């Protein structure tokens, strides 16, 4: 006989909203994505057979950024990417902390960022 088991990792990233002055808009805005490696347990030996190829994708998004007057965030959307946590990196976290920087608005600023944000085409 077998029983259903699972490893449950969460990628817990703490977004620190700050300005270019270094002033803290809000330090503790913490997102978590739940990655669940389901396995199965042999009851006879007691051994736990986790799927070593198990790789779950989860869209890192849904973390906002307060639109501040005369300010432009460095990232107004924190990590816009479908991040896959697989069995090899499963037990480790990958993301821990963010720090967005609200600098003076692009009204009074030249395009310091304009390298075209490289995302997945698939």
């Amino acid at each position: 006989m077998i029983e259903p088991i699972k490893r449950t990792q969460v990628v817990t990233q703490t977004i620190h909203y700050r300005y270019e002055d270094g002033a803290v808009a809000h330090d503790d805005h913490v997102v978590s994505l739940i990655f669940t490696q389901s396995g199965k347990r042999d009851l006879t030996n007691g051994k736990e057979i986790w799927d070593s190829k198990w790789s779950l994708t989860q869209t890192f998004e849904a973390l906002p950024s307060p639109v501040i007057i005369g300010y432009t965030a460095d990232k107004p959307m924190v990590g816009p990417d479908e991040v896959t946590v697989d069995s090899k990196n499963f037990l480790d976290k990958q993301n821990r902390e963010e720090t967005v920087i609200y600098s003076a608005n692009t009204i009074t600023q030249n395009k310091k960022d304009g390298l075209e944000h490289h995302h997945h085409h698939h």
Side-chain angles (χ1 to χ4, degrees):
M1 183 58 184
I2 300 295
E3 65 164 275
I5 54 177
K6 75 288 288 189
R7 294 283 67 138
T8 304
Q9 182 60 271
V10 297
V11 178
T12 304
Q13 179 177 327
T14 303
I15 291 64
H16 293 238
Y17 298 101
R18 297 204 306 153
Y19 300 83
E20 64 162 307
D21 180 79
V24 186
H26 190 244
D27 65 284
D28 188 82
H29 190 224
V30 188
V31 60
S32 57
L33 295 182
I34 297 69
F35 297 87
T36 305
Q37 175 184 92
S38 311
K40 63 85 177 292
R41 184 187 300 169
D42 173 56
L43 289 183
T44 78
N45 192 334
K47 56 178 297 179
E48 293 182 281
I49 304 77
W50 310 98
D51 192 282
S52 186
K53 306 172 282 59
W54 192 285
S55 47
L56 179 64
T57 313
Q58 198 74 214
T59 315
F60 228 116
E61 68 168 314
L63 199 297
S65 183
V67 182
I68 305 182
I69 304 298
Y71 285 94
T72 298
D74 186 272
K75 52 280 296 298
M77 186 176 176
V78 174
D81 170 65
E82 302 181 277
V83 190
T84 310
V85 173
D86 65 281
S87 188
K88 301 171 180 297
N89 60 25
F90 190 86
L91 292 307
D92 292 289
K93 75 275 85 54
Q94 64 187 154
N95 299 18
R96 292 171 56 160
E97 184 177 84
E98 179 61 76
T99 311
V100 317
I101 293 301
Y102 298 97
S103 308
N105 202 272
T106 180
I107 298 167
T108 189
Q109 297 301 147
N110 46 206
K111 298 296 185 184
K112 53 179 179 181
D113 181 76
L115 303 173
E116 180 182 68
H117 289 260
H118 295 129
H119 62 95
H120 290 216
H121 179 260
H122 182 264

